[PDB]
Design a protein around this ligand. Structure first.
Ligand SMILES: Nc1ncnc2c1ncn2[C@@H]1O[C@H](COP(=O)(O)OP(=O)(O)O)[C@@H](O)[C@H]1O
Ligand SMILES: Nc1ncnc2c1ncn2[C@@H]1O[C@H](COP(=O)(O)OP(=O)(O)O)[C@@H](O)[C@H]1O
Ligand SMILES: Nc1ncnc2c1ncn2[C@@H]1O[C@H](COP(=O)(O)OP(=O)(O)O)[C@@H](O)[C@H]1O
Ligand code: BEF
Ligand SMILES: [Mg+2]
Ligand SMILES: [Mg+2]
Ligand SMILES: [Mg+2]
Ligand SMILES: [Zn+2]
Ligand SMILES: [Zn+2]
Lengths: 328, 156, 103, 617, 49, 377, 94
């Protein structure tokens, strides 16, 4: 059974979106994943028969016949490995990829270089258990507000493999901490790891990094130091594995970076938290009239191009597949 | 893979892996029990050796004296003469990292008996050899009888 | 079933309301006999229990002079028959009710 | 059979044909009911609207009184009479093409009953109620007529009427059977209608002293399903109905009970409503629902040069002397253009206003004015709200029942303005959650096994006070405001209201206040009436302004000048989100001028307004 | 067990007595100093405990 | 519902329902019927020269020598004009009074007197009250085993005087809900399951002590009161009841109390005659229903001049103070049964506002009360 | 305690009343106490400024002492003893 809810885009304002129960049978099972738009056809069947409403009322269930995602992007074929080698043979390919990183954004080439480094990552290694070395590169984006750190992280989510998005505080489906919670409707225990555990072989984007809870901070420290979150609740004594590269965005104290202070006074994170990072790029706001002019031109062009009534970089799909093959 | 379990695997030996997250308390089952008629005082001895491992109790007490009046439900279990074996319920969950991003990990109820009881503790990562099965609460509830627990190396 | 070790033939407990000849009967409290009954639960000792795992417990049925010989939280060594009671679902309505009759 | 029922049915079908209301000079006289029947045939609809005034006029209203007092008893007779009338004239629409159900709706009742006016002596009668919609359920089928499969001589009986409760067909497809113990329903030969339950609530103005609000459950059966969104004032017309209740088991008073064997059954009920229909209270559809004088009015405003100045002066007539706040609130009501790039990221256009100032500086006054003037708005205070109240809420449909979603404060503000008074007092957890929705523009529910993800396109108009009570000039905005810099960053605009001992303004304000108290709504001199303002606002919203090359150049130059102003210290620094704010404010101003093209003058005005927004510390 | 000063992600640094789910009775959830007994315990960030 | 020992229910708050209730044939005594002789007696009393002082001393007769306090309480009981706007909205004449000063100044007794006299009212005390406790809460009626909506102290005290004792001891978190109630006379609650606005036309009467449980002349007035300015701005009258060792005053008070201890259930030692509480309640009620003052132009000019005079550290002037003079003058006129507001009413209201805050003894630049100067018998 | 409780109940039955001369004595004592509190409002022995509750406490103690003798009429020596107790409550301070 798949519960279908109307897409929020087409819902008129002020109305509660409605849910209809779609029934999948035979080989139709597990052809969709939650959070993905679908286009399904089938019989609008009247479900079997509660006296809750008093009046005689039957539930409705839509039996399914054919479901197509509106839309394996990481699949491979010999011709595209030939292509990968061909583009790899080019000169300036590093700069081409960097210019390809976050195409929606303008400026801060250091940030693009750092995020590309994090995506490609170092070589995992394990010397027969004698010595273990992290094979990931962690990037921290400590920048002043309104510098598109959030949008950069959203782009990374779009363009990464095994990528999870977590927040320092608020509401999220991933809590950065291992937990044992029981669903009241079904009444059974589930062992859910944090975003760190979920991104076992990928990246974990942690926005609002400065605004973490104490438990979240401790779990972040554990994951970054030993690459293995341990859980000891409700009788479950085990150490889950989380070997993840962390791309984090944090805000300097006071909503602005003070240059005369060192990194210690600018961010509330303590030194052991920062030391495990590799690329600590501070996105300081720069007051240049010409840079602001070029930024405003970019922003205005993008904003006008989006109006419903008025209207060297590598393509994104190639970037996807080439990054995956490079890592693999 | 635990998500790849299919109706084609019903009543077939299936190899799969996961994590043990809960071990229920030992429950004693019947493998040989002596009964008596309340009227006839007729002793009997039922044997339930053939898969006394389904969740439900299958080979039930007779409602009439042997070969068949006696009166319905005349049988009482002589407890000091019966012989029992123990059953323990385990629950397996997919490895937490190898799950869809925003989806609750799929867990599957499992059952073991005799010398396979008290062989694992919650949190252990195990590989399971057992019979994929079906239990009625149109829909049915899948579960696995345990035949062998390949317990990996765990915390010392 | 508890008050005797061997399984006796089940005779339903019917309170005599009338005489054999239909005369009304007045129950005589203070002449009828009552026996103290107490059930205690014994859990695995924390000193010897494995750490980080759920505990296991057994139920003990005490009777007559054995009642109220313990306080919750005590460490006790109860000895008695490990009897199993009830049809245990074998009779149509998951195991058998198991308890340690207290000696 | 009943002779009186036959009489009322034949009279009903008689005046469905004989009735004819005059068209005065233009059109002579025409059969209004026959005209509606022709309209029904033309549009193939399923419900007929009958004015109660006409029935009152006809035959000294004796039949009107009879049908109003005992509507439920005569309803089948009404259906039969209408069916015979349809058979007489235009019987083509009789069948579905098995049979099409005809719905009769009465409108324009003489009186309106409030929810607290419900009485037992009106049970089963026709009346009207007026309430605010709180919870709406799914449109579900109900058994209009039910078919079943026989037990002995297994076979299906076809198209048997289903009453308000489960029914068993006395007759059988095999006449010799006469057995009905086990019937197996078949959906194919079972008719259905549309069922939806709406929980209305008593409006604020009708609440007595001290009483907490009272609410009623209204069932919409027919085409009227999903006709009202949560949080709207609607007028419901229908029949007063009762439904069995099992909850009132321990209540004081002797419980009515039926004895039959024994045949015991507790006759406990609760009052509900079955509404026949619901009435609420591009530019082409908008242009259509106006009168000629209204269109002339709106058009005259569109051409005037002083339209901007007059509109700005008209906002909040009671408040005197604050023009920046009026401009900001007017812009917020005019809204913006919300846009999505090719990338899928969405650019919100609606404006967010944060007002902070000294006590008694009319900060609430603007909030209290916005509610009652904007088409949809929600006003809330600080300590009197929670996160689950502001966003979507999860409650049981009934006690010990399945949980259901309830639209929160922001949901009623969808595509509207949500006024939040005393932001600083309102809880820090509620603070985090409200703001997080302002960034996301959506809300996600994951409590008690519900995964509904709503959309929140709402305009925030939030007021607050400086920490400690009174503003301090020397300290910057962030020092006197408890909020952190990014929270201010998400807001489009800021207005800071200051108090000072100036005798001229003190005298003018004292005179204004005393005059307002003495002469009420007298000589307040509003440039335009509120309805005209709302007419213009509704029209302006239809437009979607466009930019020019000069507009692009001027926007870039103004952003450059603002950034040069920053650390040229500032109250709060400037960002590119400020550039987006100027873009949306400029297009809002152009919409205010009803001009499809933004001029550099609009950009200059928006830039200047932001400049007074950032007062030098 | 390798334990941070504040403890592990969820595992406590020292023994903690809590209640089990199914009967709310006393049992030891864990703790580094008791789960690892008879061996060693490695505590990093000692000053943050 | 009606009793002669308490004020009758306000008809303005029940104006909406009575016309339909007459059709409903409920036939309950909503209002007490005033005889023609009673109306003539009321008019005769309104013609008396010492009406204001008489009605002041009639409230809380046993309380001795709290003259301004009793007058302010009387004015609050009368209330202001309940204006209504044709466009929409309404300005209500509910007077909110704060009492602050030394302990054992009979603030609690005045609070109890008011709580007894008013038709509808709830007496809460400091830490006892809570934010959901005032306003509204959801409760489970065990009889029906159903979540039933129930109102709190503020909504319960609608149309009456809500007595709050130990005001200072309340946490500022609980005090937040008073911000909307004391000004808009409504409470808008948007908690889980309910999203609406509630009408709470309740005039707060709050008693508190200065920080340190006693007045400190060294500290300024605003520091001694120690409340956020937005709160203190909402209060129309603030009383600095002061306990000062005056031999004549102490002798008079001691004589009054000791004489109160002369019988088992004695009579008031107040030498001056007082109106019996039955007629006093009848008079106040009748003045509430059948008097609706309108401000005159001369009163408007005097109000503007007075407001400018006050609006020229010590407590600051406020537009709420302007609306407070408006309400107080309206109430003073409504007491005199006059249908309009005159200049003397505004003068009396300004005198009350100045005297309650002890403005006649405070230094302008620094709010230190001149203890020798402020002394009054 | 049984006999003491019986006597205390019997005393609680009585409701004594004050006297004119007694009232004058109490009033003068309260005035003097208020003056004394005003004088040493910041001395080393400021046990607190006197309040009307002090007068009420004097009355209450005098009535209790009258009850103790099983009398319906407050006596002057009872007031003297109540004043003595109130004063010597702080006598150990020296
Ligand atoms: N370097 C940049 N180039 C283009 N647009 C930018 C740049 N920095 C910020 N923006 C834009 O500024 C706006 C503010 O949002 P964003 O910068 O993502 O917020 P924050 O950094 O505070 O999370 C966005 O529309 C973003 O695209
Ligand atoms: N510029 C003003 N114009 C009109 N009325 C004002 C003005 N300033 C203060 N007031 C009046 O004084 C009172 C102030 O209330 P208000 O400022 O809305 O409370 P808050 O400051 O907590 O938001 C209102 O009655 C309001 O009408
Ligand atoms: N001026 C006064 N007039 C009448 N009684 C007074 C006066 N001052 C004090 N009292 C009496 O002293 C006590 C103090 O009153 P209470 O309200 O309890 O004090 P507080 O003002 O601290 O709340 C009461 O018994 C009261 O009757
Ligand atoms: F000592 Be009092 F209650 F202000
Ligand atoms: Mg951000
Ligand atoms: Mg306000
Ligand atoms: Mg007090
Ligand atoms: Zn037998
Ligand atoms: Zn049949």
């Amino acid at each position: 059974r798949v519960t279908l809810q109307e897409a929020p885009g087409t819902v008129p304002p002020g109305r509660l979106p409605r849910h209809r129960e779609v029934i999948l049978l035979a080989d139709l099972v597990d052809v969709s994943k939650p959070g993905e738009e679908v286009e399904v056809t089938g019989i609008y069947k009247n479900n079997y028969d509660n006296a809750k409403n008093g009046f005689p009322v039957f539930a409705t269930i839509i039996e399914a016949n054919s479901i197509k995602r509106r839309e394996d992007v990481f699949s491979w074929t010999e011709e595209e490995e030939r292509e990968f080698r061909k583009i790899s043979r080019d000169r300036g390919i590093i700069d081409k990829i960097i210019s390809s990183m976050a195409p929606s954004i303008y400026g801060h080439r250091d940030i693009k270089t750092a995020v590309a480094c994090s995506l490609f990552g170092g070589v995992p290694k394990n010397v027969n258990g004698k010595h273990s070395i992290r094979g990931d590169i962690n990037v921290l984006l400590l920048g002043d507000p309104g510098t598109a750190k959030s949008q950069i992280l959203k782009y990374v989510e779009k363009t990464a493999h095994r990528a999870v998005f977590a927040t320092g505080q608020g509401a999220s489906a991933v809590g950065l901490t291992a937990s044992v919670r029981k669903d009241p409707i079904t009444k059974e225990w589930t062992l859910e790891g944090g975003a760190l555990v979920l991104a076992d072989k990928g990246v974990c984007l942690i926005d609002e990094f400065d605004k973490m809870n104490d438990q979240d901070r401790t779990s972040i420290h554990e994951a970054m130091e030993q690459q293995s979150i341990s859980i000891s609740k409700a009788g479950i004594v085990t150490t889950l594995q989380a070997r993840c590269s962390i791309i984090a965005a944090a805000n300097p104290n006071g909503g602005r970076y003070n240059s005369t202070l060192p990194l210690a006074q600018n961010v509330s994170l303590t030194e052991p938290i920062l030391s495990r990072f590799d690329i600590l790029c501070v996105v300081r706001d720069l007051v240049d009239e010409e840079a602001d002019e070029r930024l405003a031109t970019f922003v205005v062009d993008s904003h006008v191009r989006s109006h419903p009534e008025n209207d060297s970089p590598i393509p994104q799909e190639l970037l996807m597949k080439y990054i995956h093959y490079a890592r693999t | 893979p635990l998500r790849d379990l299919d109706s084609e695997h019903v009543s077939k030996i299936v190899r799969l892996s996961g994590i043990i997250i809960s071990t229920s308390v030992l429950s004693s089952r019947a493998t040989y029990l002596s009964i008596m008629c309340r009227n006839c005082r007729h002793t009997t001895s039922i044997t339930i050796n053939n898969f006394n491992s389904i969740t439900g109790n299958t080979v039930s007490l007779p409602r009439s004296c042997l070969s068949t009046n006696c009166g319905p439900d005349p049988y009482i279990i002589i407890h000091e003469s019966s012989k029992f074996i123990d059953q323990q319920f385990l629950k397996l969950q997919e490895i937490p990292e190898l799950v869809p991003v925003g989806e609750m990990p799929r867990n599957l109820t499992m059952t073991c008996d005799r010398y396979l009881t008290n062989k694992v503790i919650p949190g252990t990562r195990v590989t399971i050899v057992g019979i994929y099965s079906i239990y009625n609460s149109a829909i049915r509830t899948p579960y696995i009888k345990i035949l062998g627990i390949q317990s990996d190396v765990e915390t010392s | 079933a508890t008050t005797t070790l061997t399984t006796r033939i089940p005779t339903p407990a019917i309170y005599p309301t009338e005489d054999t000849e239909g005369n009304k009967l007045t129950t005589e409290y203070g002449y009828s006999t009552f026996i103290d009954h107490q059930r205690i639960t014994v859990q695995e000792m924390p000193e010897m229990a494995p750490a980080g795992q759920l505990p296991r417990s057994i139920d003990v049925i005490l009777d007559d002079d054995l009642v109220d010989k313990t306080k919750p939280g005590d460490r006790v060594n109860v000895v008695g028959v490990f009897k199993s009671l009830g049809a245990g679902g074998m009779n149509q309505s998951i195991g058998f009710k198991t308890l340690i009759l207290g000696n | 059979d009943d002779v009186t029922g036959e009489k009322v049915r034949e009279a009903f079908e008689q005046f469905l044909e004989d009735f004819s209301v005059q068209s005065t000079d233009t059109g002579e006289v025409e059969k209004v009911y026959r005209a509606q029947i022709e309209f029904m045939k033309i549009y193939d609809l399923n419900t007929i609207y009958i004015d109660y005034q006409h029935l009152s006029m006809r035959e000294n209203g004796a039949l009107a009184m009879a049908i109003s007092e005992q509507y439920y008893r005569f309803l089948p007779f009404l259906q039969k009479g209408l069916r015979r009338v349809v058979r007489k004239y235009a019987p083509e629409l009789l069948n579905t093409s098995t049979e099409r159900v005809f719905q009769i709706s009465f409108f324009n009742l003489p009186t309106v009953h409030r929810i607290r006016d419900i009485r037992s002596e009106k049970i089963g009668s026709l009346l009207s109620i007026s309430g605010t919609v709180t919870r709406t359920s799914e449109v579900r089928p109900e058994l209009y007529k039910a078919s079943f499969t026989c037990d002995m001589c297994r076979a299906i009986v076809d198209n048997v009427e289903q009453s308000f409760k489960y029914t068993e067909p006395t007759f059988c497809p095999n006449p010799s059977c006469e057995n009905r113990a086990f019937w197996t329903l078949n959906v194919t030969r079972s008719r259905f209608l549309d069922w939806q339950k709406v929980r209305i609530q008593e409006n604020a103005n009708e609440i007595p002293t001290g009483s907490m609000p009272r609410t009623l459950d209204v069932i919409l059966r027919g085409d009227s399903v999903e006709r009202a969104k949560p949080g709207d004032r609607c007028k419901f017309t229908g029949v007063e109905i009762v439904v069995p209740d099992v909850t009132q088991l321990g209540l004081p008073g002797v419980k009515p009970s039926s004895t039959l064997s024994l045949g015991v059954r507790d006759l406990t009920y609760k009052i509900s409503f079955l509404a026949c229909h619901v009435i609420s209270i591009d530019q082409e559809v908008f242009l259509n629902s106006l009168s000629s004088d209204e269109i002339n009015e709106l058009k005259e405003m569109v051409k005037d040069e002083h339209i901007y100045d007059k509109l700005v002066r008209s906002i909040a007539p009671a408040v005197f002397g604050h023009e920046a706040v009026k401009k900001g609130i007017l812009l917020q009501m005019l809204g913006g253009v919300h846009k999505s790039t090719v990338e899928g990221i969405k650019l919100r256009g609606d404006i967010n206003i944060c007002v902070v100032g000294d006590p008694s500086t009319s900060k609430s006054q603007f909030l209290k004015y916005v509610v009652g003037f904007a088409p949809r708005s929600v006003y809330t205070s600080g300590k009197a709200s929670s996160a689950a109240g502001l966003t979507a809420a999860v409650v049981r449909d009934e006690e010990g029942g399945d949980y259901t979603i309830e639209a929160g404060a922001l949901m009623l503000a969808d595509n509207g303005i949500c006024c939040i008074d005393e932001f600083d007092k309102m809880d820090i957890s509620d603070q985090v959650a409200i703001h997080e929705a302002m960034e996301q523009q959506t809300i996600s529910i994951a409590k008690a096994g519900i995964h509904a993800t709503l959309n929140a396109r709402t305009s925030i108009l939030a007021a607050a006070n400086p920490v400690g009570g009174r503003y301090n000039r020397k300290l910057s905005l962030r020092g006197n405001l408890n909020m952190t810099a990014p929270i201010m960053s998400r807001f489009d605009l800021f207005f800071v209201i200051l108090d000072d001992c100036n005798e001229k303004i003190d005298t003018e304000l004292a005179s204004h206040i005393v005059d307002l108290h003495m002469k009420r709504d007298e000589a307040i001199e509003p440039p335009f009436s509120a309805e005209q303002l709302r007419r213009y606002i509704k029209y302006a919203r239809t437009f979607k302004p466009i930019l020019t090359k000069e507009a692009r150049s001027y926007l870039v130059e103004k952003y450059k000048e603002l950034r040069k102003d920053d650390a040229q210290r500032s109250s709060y620094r400037i960002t590119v989100r400020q550039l987006e704010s100027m873009i949306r404010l400029s297009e809002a101003i152009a919409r205010a001028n009803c001009v499809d093209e933004i001029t550099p003058s609009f950009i200059a005005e928006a830039y200047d307004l932001l400049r007074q927004s950032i007062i030098r510390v | 067990v390798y334990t941070s000063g504040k403890g592990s992600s969820a595992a406590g640094l020292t023994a903690s007595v809590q209640r089990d789910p199914m009967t709310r009775e006393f049992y030891l959830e864990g703790g580094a100093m008791v789960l690892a007994d008879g061996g060693v315990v490695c505590i990093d960030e000692f000053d943050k405990m | 519902k009606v009793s002669d020992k308490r004020l009758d229910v306000d008809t303005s708050t029940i104006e909406q329902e009575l016309m339909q209730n007459k059709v409903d044939h409920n036939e309950v005594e909503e209002v007490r019927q005033i005889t023609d002789q009673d109306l003539a007696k009321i008019r005769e009393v309104a013609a008396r020269e010492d009406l204001y002082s008489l009605l002041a001393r009639s409230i809380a007769p046993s309380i001795y020598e709290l003259e301004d306090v009793k007058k302010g309480i009387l004015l609050q009981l009368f209330g202001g004009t309940n204006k209504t706007f044709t466009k929409g909205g309404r300005y209500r004449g509910d007077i909110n009074i704060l009492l602050c000063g030394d302990p054992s100044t009979s603030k609690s007794q005045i609070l109890q007197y008011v709580h007894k006299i008013t038709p509808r009212g709830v007496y809460t005390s400091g830490k006892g009250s809570s934010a959901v406790g005032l306003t509204a809460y959801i409760t489970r009626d065990v009889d029906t085993k159903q979540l039933v909506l129930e109102s709190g102290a503020l909504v319960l005290s609608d149309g009456g005087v809500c007595c709050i004792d130990e005001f200072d001891k309340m946490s500022d978190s609980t005090r937040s809900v008073l911000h909307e109630v004391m000004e808009q006379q409504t409470i808008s609650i948007a908690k889980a399951g309910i999203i609406t606005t509630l009408n709470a036309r309740s005039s707060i009467l709050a008693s508190a002590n200065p920080i340190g449980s006693r007045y400190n002349p060294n500290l300024p007035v605003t520091e001694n009161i120690d409340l956020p300015p937005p709160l203190l701005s909402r209060f129309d009258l603030v009383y600095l009841v002061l306990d000062k060792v005056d031999e004549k005053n102490d002798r008079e008070l001691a004589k009054h109390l000791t004489n109160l201890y002369l019988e088992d259930k004695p009579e008031h030692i107040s030498q001056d005659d007082v109106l019996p509480v039955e007629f006093l309640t009848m008079y106040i009620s009748y003045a509430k229903e059948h008097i609706h003052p309108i401000i005159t132009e001369a009163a408007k000019t005097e109000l503007v001049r007075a407001y400018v005079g006050m609006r020229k550290k010590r407590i600051t002037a406020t537009t709420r103070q302007l609306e407070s003079m408006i309400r107080l003058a309206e109430a003073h006129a409504k007491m005199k049964l006059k249908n309009v507001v005159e200049l003397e009413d505004v003068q009396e209201a300004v005198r009350l506002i100045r005297s309650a805050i002890k403005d006649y003894a405070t230094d302008p630049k620094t709010g230190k009360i001149d203890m020798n100067l402020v002394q009054t018998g | 305690p049984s006999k003491m409780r019986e006597y205390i109940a019997y005393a609680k039955t009585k409701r004594p009343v004050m006297s004119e001369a007694v009232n004058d004595y109490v009033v003068q004592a309260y005035i003097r106490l208020r003056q004394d509190s005003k004088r040493e409002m910041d001395s080393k022995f400021s046990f607190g400024q006197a309040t009307p509750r002090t007068l009420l406490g004097i009355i209450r103690l005098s009535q209790a002492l009258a009850k103790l003798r099983l009398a319906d009429m407050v006596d002057i020596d009872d007031v003297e003893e109540a004043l003595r107790l109130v004063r010597v409550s702080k006598e150990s301070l020296y």
